Amino acid sequence: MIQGVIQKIAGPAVIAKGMLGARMYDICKVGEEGLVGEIIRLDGDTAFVQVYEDTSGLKVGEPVVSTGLPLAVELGPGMLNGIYDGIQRPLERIREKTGIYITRGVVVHALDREKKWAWTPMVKPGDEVRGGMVLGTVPEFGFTHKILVPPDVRGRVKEVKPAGEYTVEEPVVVLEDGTELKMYHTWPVRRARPVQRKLDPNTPFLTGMRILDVLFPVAMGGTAAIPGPFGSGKTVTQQSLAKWSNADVVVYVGCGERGNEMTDVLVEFPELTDPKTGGPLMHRTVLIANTSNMPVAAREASIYVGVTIAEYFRDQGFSVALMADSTSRWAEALREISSRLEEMPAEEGYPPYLAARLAAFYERAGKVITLGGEEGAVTIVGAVSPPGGDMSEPVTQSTLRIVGAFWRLDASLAFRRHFPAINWNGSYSLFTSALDPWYRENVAEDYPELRDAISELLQREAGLQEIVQLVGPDALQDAERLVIEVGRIIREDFLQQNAYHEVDAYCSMKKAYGIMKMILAFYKEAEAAIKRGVSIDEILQLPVLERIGRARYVSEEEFPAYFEEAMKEIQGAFKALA
């Protein structure tokens, strides 16, 4: 394959001559040390290659070898319980042979090449094979990993290895045309994997946090964004989504950020426990970690690796949740790379194609029918960090145009220790009108009609905020005091949630529905009593008010009897009072 020599060195830009026949965006090996780089421009006998790591110490005349393939990941068994950087290099095995630093030109393999797996063939010779079907199964933790053929491969099965212990390198199925199929295959990170058909987002993706899945729901295969400042819950809400959602496999992608912030999540994650099995949470997640001082190419290509791995796990029939943390850093890396290519800037120094890249990243989410006939979905949640809370940045404007949900955080509620601290007058969801037929069948008939009651009750105090800062709350008329108090108990029992509690960290949908029904019963009967000229002070002292506070901490199995008893007590209280 194509080999050449260095002609000119100027910073990270290397010009190699004798490169006639190389292809654009291929990966090369630059110099004797083994540095890697992409070809960005071809001209006659030369080829412009940009090196990822620094080029100090290189000399003119050192060989340049092109691999002949673009940037790609290795997809196969052994990716769970792993930690990778932006270009799928396992950090744990890098540590074992290098130390506390990362030397240049290190060569490691993404998948372990010497571990035995329990192969079980699901095919026999003579069978027709097309792209996307299953050859066999391999057990892996609590999952039965399926060995798929590449989407470009079709033929007829010739020989099949019997069941036994094999490595990922051993060929297991050979076709009639001589093609050898192993336990793994490679796929470029910038090309989307094919599907049969993309379905409709008619099922909800359950978070486990009350306010999100009640007021601003996100459907399965949908896209959401969560901006905010520091100490605003960005990190805790994501790791609660990782534990409590109905997703099978979780992918956490961390773009280039602070080193100690990376150390926090690298240390606390092995401690977390999977609620479904009681084992470690590490057994079902894949981590991508990048610090601010690692090469900019890895930081830019970090999210593509994660979304390709998520697509690979989608193709096997699972439901995958992908968490992009601080996409503003990815935009910064893209800006730096575009600056190194002397492109003309637009807006705040960003390249003109920022919106195209953001769209091309977000559209890989969705619920599909896989090539093998199974169903799967990928859900993407992306964090955004504004520089000073300004929503006019190009990144947030480009994200707003494409996401289906927008969970705005604010530090004003975090100052009151009110968590989750999302703003419920700034957030919006677009999946509400499509989830209603599922809602009125699976939860309860009145739920879409009941949600509007909570929304209007919360809205009516926002129209009373112009009088409360002028006149004290106690001086209000009882007809407005009722609205203020019921909205207050809504804010302090339904909207707030303790993520560290044993039973408050997860709430099913019928529990929340019962809470809203019970709050409406309280408000309606209280308004009826107020119509009879009674003081509102006796209403605030009612014993049912503590029944309202205690509804959060009841067990999921224990809830219905408590709900019925609260319904009986609240029916007895108000028309016993004259």
Binding site: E342, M344, P345, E347, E348
Partner: protein
């Protein structure tokens, strides 16, 4: 009256002035880097006449 006037009238005009000045400065910076991008190409084209 003073609180409502300061909230409704004074602040939005100031903010619009901020936005307008920011846009003007950014546009001038873009015009200024275009000339440098042309001049570098002219420099590269100059020293290629007979190598």
């Amino acid at each position: 009256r003073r609180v409502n006037a300061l909230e409704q009238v004074v602040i939005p005009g100031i903010r619009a002035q901020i936005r307008f000045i920011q846009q003007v400065l950014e546009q001038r910076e873009r015009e200024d880097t275009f000339r440098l991008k042309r001049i570098k190409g002219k420099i590269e084209a100059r020293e290629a006449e007979e190598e």
